[PDB]
PDB file of C-alpha atoms in Angstrom:
ATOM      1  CA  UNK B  15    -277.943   8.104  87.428  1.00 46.13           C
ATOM      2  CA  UNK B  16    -277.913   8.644  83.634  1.00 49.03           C
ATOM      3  CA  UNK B  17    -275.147   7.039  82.324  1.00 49.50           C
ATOM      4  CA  UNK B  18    -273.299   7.157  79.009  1.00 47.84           C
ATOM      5  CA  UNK B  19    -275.174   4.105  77.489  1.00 48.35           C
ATOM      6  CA  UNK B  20    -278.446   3.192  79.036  1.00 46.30           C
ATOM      7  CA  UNK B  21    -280.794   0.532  78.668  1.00 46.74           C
ATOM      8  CA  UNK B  22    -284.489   0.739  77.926  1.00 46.46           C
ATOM      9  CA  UNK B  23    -287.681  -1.324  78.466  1.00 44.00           C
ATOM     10  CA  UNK B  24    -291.124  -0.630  77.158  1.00 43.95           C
ATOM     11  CA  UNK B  25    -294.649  -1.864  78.017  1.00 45.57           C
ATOM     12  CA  UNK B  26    -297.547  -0.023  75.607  1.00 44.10           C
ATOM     13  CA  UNK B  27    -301.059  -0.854  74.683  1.00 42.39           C
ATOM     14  CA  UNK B  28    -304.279   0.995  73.900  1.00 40.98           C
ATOM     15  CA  UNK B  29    -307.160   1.073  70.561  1.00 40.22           C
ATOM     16  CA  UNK B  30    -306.228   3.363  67.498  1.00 39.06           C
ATOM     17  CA  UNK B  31    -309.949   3.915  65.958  1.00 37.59           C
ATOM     18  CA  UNK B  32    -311.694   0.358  66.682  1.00 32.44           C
ATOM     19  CA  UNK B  33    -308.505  -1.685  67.300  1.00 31.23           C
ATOM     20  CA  UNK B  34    -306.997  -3.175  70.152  1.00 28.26           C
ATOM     21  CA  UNK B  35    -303.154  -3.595  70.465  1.00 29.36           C
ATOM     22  CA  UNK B  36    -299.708  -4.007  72.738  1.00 26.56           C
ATOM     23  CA  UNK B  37    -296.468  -4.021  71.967  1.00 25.62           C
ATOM     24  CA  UNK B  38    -293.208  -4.453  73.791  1.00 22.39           C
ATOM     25  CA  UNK B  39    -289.642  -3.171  73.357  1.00 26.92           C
ATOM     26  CA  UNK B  40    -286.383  -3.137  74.493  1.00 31.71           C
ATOM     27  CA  UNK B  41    -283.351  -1.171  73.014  1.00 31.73           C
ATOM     28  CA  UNK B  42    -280.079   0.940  74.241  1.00 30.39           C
ATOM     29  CA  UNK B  43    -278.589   4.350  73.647  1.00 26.49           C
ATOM     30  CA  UNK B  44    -276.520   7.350  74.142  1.00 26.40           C
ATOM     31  CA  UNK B  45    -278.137  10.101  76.290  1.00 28.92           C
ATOM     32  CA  UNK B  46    -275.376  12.403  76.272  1.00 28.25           C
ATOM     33  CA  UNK B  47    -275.025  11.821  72.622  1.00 28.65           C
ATOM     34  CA  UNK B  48    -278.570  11.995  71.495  1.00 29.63           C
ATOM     35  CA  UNK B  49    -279.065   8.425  69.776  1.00 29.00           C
ATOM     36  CA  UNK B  50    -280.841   5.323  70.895  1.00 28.74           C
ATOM     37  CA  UNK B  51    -282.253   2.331  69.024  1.00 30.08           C
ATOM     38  CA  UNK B  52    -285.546   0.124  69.663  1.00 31.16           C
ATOM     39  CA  UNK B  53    -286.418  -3.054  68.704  1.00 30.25           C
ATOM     40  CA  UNK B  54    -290.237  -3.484  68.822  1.00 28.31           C
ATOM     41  CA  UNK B  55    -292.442  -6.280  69.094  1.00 27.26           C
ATOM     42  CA  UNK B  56    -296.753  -5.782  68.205  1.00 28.35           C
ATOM     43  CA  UNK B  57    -297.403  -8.774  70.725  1.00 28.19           C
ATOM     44  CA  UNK B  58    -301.352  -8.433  70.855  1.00 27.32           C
ATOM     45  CA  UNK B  59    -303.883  -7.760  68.148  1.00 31.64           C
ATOM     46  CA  UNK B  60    -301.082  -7.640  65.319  1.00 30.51           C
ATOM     47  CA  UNK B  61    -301.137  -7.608  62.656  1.00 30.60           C
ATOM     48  CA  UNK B  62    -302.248  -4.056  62.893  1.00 30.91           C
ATOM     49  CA  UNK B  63    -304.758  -2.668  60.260  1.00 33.49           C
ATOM     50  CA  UNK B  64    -302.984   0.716  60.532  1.00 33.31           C
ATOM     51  CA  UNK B  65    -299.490   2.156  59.755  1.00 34.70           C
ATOM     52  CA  UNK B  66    -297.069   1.357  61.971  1.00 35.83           C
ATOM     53  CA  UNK B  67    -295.636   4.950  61.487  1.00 34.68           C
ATOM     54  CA  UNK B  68    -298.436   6.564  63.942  1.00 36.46           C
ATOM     55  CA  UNK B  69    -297.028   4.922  66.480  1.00 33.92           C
ATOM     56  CA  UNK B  70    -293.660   5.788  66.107  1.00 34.91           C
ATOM     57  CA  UNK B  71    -293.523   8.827  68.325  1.00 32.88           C
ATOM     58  CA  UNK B  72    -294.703   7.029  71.449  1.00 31.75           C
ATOM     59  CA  UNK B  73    -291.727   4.579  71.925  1.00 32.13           C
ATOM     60  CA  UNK B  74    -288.197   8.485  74.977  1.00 28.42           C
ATOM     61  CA  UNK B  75    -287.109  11.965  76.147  1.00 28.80           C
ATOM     62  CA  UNK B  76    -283.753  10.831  78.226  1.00 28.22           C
ATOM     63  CA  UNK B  77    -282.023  10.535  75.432  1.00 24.47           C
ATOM     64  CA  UNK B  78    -281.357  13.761  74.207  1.00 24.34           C
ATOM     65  CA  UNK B  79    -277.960  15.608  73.647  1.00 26.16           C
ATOM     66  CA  UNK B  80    -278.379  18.894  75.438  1.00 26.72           C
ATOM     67  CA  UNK B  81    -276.274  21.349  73.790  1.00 27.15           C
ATOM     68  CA  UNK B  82    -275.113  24.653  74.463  1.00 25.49           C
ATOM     69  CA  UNK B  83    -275.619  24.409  78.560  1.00 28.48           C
ATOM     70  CA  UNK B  84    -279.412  23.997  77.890  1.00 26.26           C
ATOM     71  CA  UNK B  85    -280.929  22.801  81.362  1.00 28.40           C
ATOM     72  CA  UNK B  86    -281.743  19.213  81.160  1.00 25.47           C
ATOM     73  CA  UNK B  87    -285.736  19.244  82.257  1.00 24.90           C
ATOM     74  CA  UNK B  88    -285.236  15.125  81.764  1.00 25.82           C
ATOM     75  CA  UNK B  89    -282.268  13.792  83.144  1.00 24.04           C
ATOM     76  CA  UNK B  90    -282.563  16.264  85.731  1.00 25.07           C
ATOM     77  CA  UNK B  91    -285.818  14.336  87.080  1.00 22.44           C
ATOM     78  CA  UNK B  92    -283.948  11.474  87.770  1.00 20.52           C
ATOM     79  CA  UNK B  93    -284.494   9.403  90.279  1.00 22.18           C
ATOM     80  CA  UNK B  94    -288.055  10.528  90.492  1.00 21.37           C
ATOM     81  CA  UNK B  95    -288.360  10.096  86.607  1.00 18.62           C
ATOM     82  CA  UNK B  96    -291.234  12.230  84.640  1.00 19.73           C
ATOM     83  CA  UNK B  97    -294.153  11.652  82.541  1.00 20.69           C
ATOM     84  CA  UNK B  98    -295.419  13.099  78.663  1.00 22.19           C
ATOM     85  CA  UNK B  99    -299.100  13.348  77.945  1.00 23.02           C
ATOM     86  CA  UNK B 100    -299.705  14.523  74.064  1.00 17.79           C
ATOM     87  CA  UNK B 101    -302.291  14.564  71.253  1.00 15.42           C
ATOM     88  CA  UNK B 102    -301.136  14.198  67.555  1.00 16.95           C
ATOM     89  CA  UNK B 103    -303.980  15.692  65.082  1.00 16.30           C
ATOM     90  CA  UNK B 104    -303.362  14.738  61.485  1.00 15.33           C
ATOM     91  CA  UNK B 105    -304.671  16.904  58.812  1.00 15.43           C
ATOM     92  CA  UNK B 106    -307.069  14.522  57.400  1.00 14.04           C
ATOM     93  CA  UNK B 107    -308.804  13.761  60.871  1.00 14.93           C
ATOM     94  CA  UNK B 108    -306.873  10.938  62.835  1.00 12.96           C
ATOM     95  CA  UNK B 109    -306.214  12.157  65.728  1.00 13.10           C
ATOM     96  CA  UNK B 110    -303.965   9.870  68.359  1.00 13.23           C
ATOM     97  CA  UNK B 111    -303.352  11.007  72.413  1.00 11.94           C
ATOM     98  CA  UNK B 112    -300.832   9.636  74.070  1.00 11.80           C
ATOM     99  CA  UNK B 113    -299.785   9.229  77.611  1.00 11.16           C
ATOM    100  CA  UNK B 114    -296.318   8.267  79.255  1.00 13.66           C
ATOM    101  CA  UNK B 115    -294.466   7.065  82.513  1.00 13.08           C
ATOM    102  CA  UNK B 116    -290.851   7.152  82.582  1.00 10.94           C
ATOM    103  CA  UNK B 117    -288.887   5.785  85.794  1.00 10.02           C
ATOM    104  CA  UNK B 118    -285.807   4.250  86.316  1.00 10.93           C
ATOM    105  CA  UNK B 119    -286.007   0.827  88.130  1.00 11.21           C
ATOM    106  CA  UNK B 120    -281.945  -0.956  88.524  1.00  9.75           C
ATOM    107  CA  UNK B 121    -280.445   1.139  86.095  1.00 10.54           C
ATOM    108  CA  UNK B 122    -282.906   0.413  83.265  1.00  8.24           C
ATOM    109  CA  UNK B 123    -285.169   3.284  81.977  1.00  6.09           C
ATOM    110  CA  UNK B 124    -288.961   1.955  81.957  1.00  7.71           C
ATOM    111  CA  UNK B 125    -291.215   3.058  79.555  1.00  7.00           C
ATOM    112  CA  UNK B 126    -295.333   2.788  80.454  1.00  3.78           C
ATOM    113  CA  UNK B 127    -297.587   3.852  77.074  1.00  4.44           C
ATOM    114  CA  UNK B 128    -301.392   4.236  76.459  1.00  3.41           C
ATOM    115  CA  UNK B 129    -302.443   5.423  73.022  1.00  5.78           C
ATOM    116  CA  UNK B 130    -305.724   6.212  71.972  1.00  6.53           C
ATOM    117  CA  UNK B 131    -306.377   6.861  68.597  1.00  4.26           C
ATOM    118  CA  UNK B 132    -310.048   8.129  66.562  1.00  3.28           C
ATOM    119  CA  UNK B 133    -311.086   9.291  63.777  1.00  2.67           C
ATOM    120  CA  UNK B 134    -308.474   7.872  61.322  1.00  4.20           C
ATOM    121  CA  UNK B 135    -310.242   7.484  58.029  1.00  4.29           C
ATOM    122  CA  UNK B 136    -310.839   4.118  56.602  1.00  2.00           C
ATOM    123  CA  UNK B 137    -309.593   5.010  53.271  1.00  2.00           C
ATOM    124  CA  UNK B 138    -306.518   7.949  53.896  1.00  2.00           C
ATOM    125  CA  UNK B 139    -303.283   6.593  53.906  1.00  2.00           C
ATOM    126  CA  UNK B 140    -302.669   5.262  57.190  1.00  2.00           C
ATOM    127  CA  UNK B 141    -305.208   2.639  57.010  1.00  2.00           C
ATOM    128  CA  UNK B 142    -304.343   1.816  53.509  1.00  2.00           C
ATOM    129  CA  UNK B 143    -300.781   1.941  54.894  1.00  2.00           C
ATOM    130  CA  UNK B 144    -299.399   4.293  52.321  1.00  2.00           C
ATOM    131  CA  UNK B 145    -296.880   5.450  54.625  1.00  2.00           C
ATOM    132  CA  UNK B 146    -292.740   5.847  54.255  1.00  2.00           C
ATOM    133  CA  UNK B 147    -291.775   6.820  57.878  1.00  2.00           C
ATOM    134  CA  UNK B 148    -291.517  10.842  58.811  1.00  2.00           C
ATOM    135  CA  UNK B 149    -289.157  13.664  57.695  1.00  2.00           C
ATOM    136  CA  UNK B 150    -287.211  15.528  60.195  1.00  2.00           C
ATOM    137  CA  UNK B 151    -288.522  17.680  62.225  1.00  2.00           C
ATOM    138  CA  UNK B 152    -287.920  20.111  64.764  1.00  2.00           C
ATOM    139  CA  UNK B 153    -290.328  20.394  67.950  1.00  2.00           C
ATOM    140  CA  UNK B 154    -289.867  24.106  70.257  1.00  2.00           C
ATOM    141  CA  UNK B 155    -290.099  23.428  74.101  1.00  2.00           C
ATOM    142  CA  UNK B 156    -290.873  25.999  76.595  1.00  2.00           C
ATOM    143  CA  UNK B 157    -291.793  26.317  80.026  1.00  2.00           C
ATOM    144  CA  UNK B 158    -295.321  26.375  80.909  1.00  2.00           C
ATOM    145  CA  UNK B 159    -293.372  21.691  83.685  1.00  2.00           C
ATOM    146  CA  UNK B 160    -292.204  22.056  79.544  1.00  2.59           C
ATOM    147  CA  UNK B 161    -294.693  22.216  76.861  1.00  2.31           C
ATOM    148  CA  UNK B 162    -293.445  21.172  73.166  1.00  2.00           C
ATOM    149  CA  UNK B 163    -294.856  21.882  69.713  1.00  2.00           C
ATOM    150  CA  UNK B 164    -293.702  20.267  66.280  1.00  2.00           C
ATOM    151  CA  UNK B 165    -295.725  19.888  62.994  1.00  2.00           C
ATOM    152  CA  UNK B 166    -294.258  16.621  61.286  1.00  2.00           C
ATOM    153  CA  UNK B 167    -294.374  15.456  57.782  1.00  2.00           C
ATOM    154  CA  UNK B 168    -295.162  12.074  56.965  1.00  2.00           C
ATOM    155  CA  UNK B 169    -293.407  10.410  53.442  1.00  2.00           C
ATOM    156  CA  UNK B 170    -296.617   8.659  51.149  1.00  2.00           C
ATOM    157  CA  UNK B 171    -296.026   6.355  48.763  1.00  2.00           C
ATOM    158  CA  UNK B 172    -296.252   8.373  45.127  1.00  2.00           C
ATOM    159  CA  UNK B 173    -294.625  11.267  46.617  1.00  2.00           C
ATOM    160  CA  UNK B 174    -296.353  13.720  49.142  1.00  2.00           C
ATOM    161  CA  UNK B 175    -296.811  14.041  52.551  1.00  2.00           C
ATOM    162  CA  UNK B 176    -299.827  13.684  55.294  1.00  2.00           C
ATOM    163  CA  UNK B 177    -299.132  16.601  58.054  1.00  2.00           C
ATOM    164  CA  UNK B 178    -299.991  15.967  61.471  1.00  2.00           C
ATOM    165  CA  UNK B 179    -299.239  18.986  64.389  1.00  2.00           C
ATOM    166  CA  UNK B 180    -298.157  17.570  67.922  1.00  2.00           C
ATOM    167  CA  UNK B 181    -299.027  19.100  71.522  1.00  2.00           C
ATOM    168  CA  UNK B 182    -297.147  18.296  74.050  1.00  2.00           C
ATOM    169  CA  UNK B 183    -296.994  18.327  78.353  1.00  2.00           C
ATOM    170  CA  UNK B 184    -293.628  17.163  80.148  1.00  2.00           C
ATOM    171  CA  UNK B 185    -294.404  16.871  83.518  1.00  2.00           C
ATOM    172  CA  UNK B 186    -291.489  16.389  86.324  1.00  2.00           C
ATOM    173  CA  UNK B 187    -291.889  13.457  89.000  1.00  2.00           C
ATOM    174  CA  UNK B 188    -289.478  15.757  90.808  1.00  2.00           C
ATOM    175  CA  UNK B 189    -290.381  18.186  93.307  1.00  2.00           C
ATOM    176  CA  UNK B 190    -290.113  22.049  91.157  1.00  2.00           C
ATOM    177  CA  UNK B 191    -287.945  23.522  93.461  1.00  2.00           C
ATOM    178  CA  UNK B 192    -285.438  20.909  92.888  1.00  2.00           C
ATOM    179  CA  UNK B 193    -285.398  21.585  89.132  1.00  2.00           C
ATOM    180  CA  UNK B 194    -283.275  24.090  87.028  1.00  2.00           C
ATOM    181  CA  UNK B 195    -285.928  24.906  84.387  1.00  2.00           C
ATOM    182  CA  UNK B 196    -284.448  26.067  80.649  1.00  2.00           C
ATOM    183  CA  UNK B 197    -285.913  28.427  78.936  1.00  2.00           C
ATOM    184  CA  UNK B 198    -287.306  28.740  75.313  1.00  2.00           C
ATOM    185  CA  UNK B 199    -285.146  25.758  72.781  1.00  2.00           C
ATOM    186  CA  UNK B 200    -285.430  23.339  70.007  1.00  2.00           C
ATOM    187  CA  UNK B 201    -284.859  19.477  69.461  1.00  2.00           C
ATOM    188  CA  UNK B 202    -284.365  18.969  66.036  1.00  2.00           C
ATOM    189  CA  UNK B 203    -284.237  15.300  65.405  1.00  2.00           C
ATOM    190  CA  UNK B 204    -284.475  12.162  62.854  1.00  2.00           C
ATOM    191  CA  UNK B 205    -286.775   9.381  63.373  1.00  2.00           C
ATOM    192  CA  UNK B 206    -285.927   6.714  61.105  1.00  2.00           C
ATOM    193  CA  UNK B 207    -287.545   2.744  60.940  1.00  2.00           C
ATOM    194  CA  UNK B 208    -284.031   0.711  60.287  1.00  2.00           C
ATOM    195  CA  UNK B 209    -285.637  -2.571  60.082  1.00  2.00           C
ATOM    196  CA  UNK B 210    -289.219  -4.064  59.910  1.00  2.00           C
ATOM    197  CA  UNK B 211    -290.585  -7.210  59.839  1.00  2.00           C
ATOM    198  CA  UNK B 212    -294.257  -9.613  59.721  1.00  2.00           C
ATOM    199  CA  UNK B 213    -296.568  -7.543  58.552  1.00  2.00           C
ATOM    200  CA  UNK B 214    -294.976  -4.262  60.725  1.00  2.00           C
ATOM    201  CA  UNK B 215    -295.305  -7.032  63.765  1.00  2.00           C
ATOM    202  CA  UNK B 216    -291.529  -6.471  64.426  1.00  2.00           C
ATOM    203  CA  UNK B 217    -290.043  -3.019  64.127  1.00  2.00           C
ATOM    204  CA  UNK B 218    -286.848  -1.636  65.001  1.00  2.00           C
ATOM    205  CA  UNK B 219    -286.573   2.326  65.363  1.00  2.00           C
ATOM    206  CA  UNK B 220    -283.907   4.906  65.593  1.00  2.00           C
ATOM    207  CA  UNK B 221    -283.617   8.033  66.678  1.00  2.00           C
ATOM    208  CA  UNK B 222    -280.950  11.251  67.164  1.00  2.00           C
ATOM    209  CA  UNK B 223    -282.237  14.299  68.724  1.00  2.00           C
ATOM    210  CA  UNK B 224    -280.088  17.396  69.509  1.00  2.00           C
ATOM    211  CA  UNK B 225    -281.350  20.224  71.417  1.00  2.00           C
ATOM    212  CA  UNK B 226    -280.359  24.041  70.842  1.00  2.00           C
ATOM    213  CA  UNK B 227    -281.020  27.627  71.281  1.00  2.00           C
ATOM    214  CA  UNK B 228    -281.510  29.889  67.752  1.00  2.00           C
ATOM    215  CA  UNK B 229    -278.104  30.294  66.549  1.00  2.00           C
ATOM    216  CA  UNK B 230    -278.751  33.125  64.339  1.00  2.00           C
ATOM    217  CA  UNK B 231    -277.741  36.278  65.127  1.00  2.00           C
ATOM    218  CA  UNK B 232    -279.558  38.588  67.267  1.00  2.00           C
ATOM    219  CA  UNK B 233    -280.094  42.293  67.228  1.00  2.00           C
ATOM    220  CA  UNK B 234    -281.110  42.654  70.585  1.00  2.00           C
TER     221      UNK B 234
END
């Protein structure tokens, strides 16, 4: 079902603090490989008052290169498909849920978003739009369907970084005892904006994400 390059198609909308929006996408990558590119397209209420950046995280699980035998909790839920609910709380009080459907309908991954964001404060950096895009990062899943953690860094103009901390539920379409669940890993990754355009009203987004146990040594 999950092929060497795969196709994907996006539908998202929801209100970050008073502020109605949806976007589209469409973009193509690598599962097995870890990489995939979308091009995105604010098609309602744009141009948004807000960084685009806060949004970033909410345009894609399939596509990351499972190293090292790690169980694949994603691909694995295929055809059934699986769904992410999160909430990102920055440090200066945004704070932005997010909740996800992922199926596959005629060989093309389809992606279903709903973002609600409060709380971001009219004159911090995201609604001055201050923002560079985000540093690296790496996020820790674990059973619990998989919970994930990650605290990202976000790049300010001036130098600097606002800090936000995500929490994360993966939840399998697929029935458990049909599932080989991993335990404890890591997806480090690199979420990067390639192109941008209209006022952040066109956006095209990359991303590589490799997953992996500790590979220092262990005493035990």
């Amino acid at each position: 079902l999950i092929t060497e390059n795969m196709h994907m198609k996006l539908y998202m909308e929801g209100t970050v603090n008073n502020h109605h929006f949806k976007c589209t996408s469409e973009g193509e990558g690598k599962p097995y490989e870890g990489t995939q590119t979308m091009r995105i397209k604010v098609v309602e209420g744009g141009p948004l008052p807000f960084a685009f950046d806060i949004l970033a995280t909410s345009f894609s699980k399939t596509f990351i290169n499972h190293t090292q035998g790690i169980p694949d909790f994603f691909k694995q839920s295929f055809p059934e498909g699986f769904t992410w609910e999160r909430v990102t709380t920055y440090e200066d009080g945004g704070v932005l849920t997010a909740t996800q459907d992922t199926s596959l309908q005629d060989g093309c991954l389809i992606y279903n978003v709903k973002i609600r964001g409060v709380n971001f404060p009219s004159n911090g950096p995201v609604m001055q739009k201050k923002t560079l895009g985000w540093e690296a990062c790496t996020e820790m899943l674990y059973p619990a369907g998989l919970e994930g953690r990650a605290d990202m860094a976000l790049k300010l103009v001036g130098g600097g970084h606002l800090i936000c901390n995500l929490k994360t539920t993966y939840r399998s379409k697929k029935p458990a005892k049909n599932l080989k669940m991993p335990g404890v890993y890591y997806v480090d990754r690199r979420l990067e904006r390639i192109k941008e355009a209209d006022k952040e009203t066109y956006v095209e987004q990359h991303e590589v994400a490799v997953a992996r146990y500790c590979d220092l040594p262990s005493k035990l």
